[PDB]
Amino acid sequence: NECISVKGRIYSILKQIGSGGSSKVFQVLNEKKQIYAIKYVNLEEADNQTLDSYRNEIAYLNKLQQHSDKIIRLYDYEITDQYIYMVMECGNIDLNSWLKKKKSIDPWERKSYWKNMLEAVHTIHQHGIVHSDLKPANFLIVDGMLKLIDFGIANQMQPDTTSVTVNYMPPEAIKDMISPKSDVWSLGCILYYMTYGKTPFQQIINQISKLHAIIDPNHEIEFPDIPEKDLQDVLKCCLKRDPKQRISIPELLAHPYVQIQ
């Protein structure tokens, strides 16, 4: 019967979904035995860089959810000098965990998840954010939909277990040692994974030349023919290494793959 109070109301902790650095996310019930997610950040030690990333996340989450229901909802929050509590709509599960168990995706459901992710990413681009590190873990499944959680700022957390990648990074991020085009690359890797059941360079299991493969022009990604050729076309347009020739989000929204059927 571990509990959390937040701006008046009490919540029972059903379990800890995940953790990350100084954060924790709990699946909880309110007094009306309704389910929610609560994120907790122990601010006790945390530099002004960490503090500000979390303050920025909360502001954008509060702003953005008026413009799109593909952004996870922030219902209430409590913030002091010691801690943060955020009450949010709780997802059934994150998309990474969900992919890693499913055999094969229903084609109409892949198309629908795809529209969901485009809308969400589109929404954050309109308000001046480039995620830059998109991956399946950033999307939750709720009400048969995909909703975005992470904005790039704030430290990513990891699902917890009761025991004890880089496949999505855009090429121009590797050569950065970054624009809305970088999120379309990462979205194409997810859709590609949803189509061919595998990430473009998911087999180059050694990292340094996984990276090398990604930035290498005369390394070619394979697009086996498939029934839905509009989907073959989406993937080929997303996965162009040259950012300036890569398809954009506004264009992807006008594409037959999302507009027909």
Ligand SMILES: COc1cc(N2CCCC2=O)ccc1Nc1nc(NC2CCOCC2)c2c(C#N)c[nH]c2n1
């Ligand atoms: C039942 O609930 C869930 C369960 C699971 N998993 C993962 C595998 C095993 C399992 O059962 C994953 C997500 C949810 N639902 C959920 N998860 C959130 N954070 C997770 C933090 C760890 O990495 C993935 C996301 C938030 C969030 C934030 N921040 C605001 N709402 C949220 N809803």
Ligand SMILES: [Mg+2]
């Ligand atoms: Mg068990």
Ligand SMILES: [Mg+2]
């Ligand atoms: Mg295990």
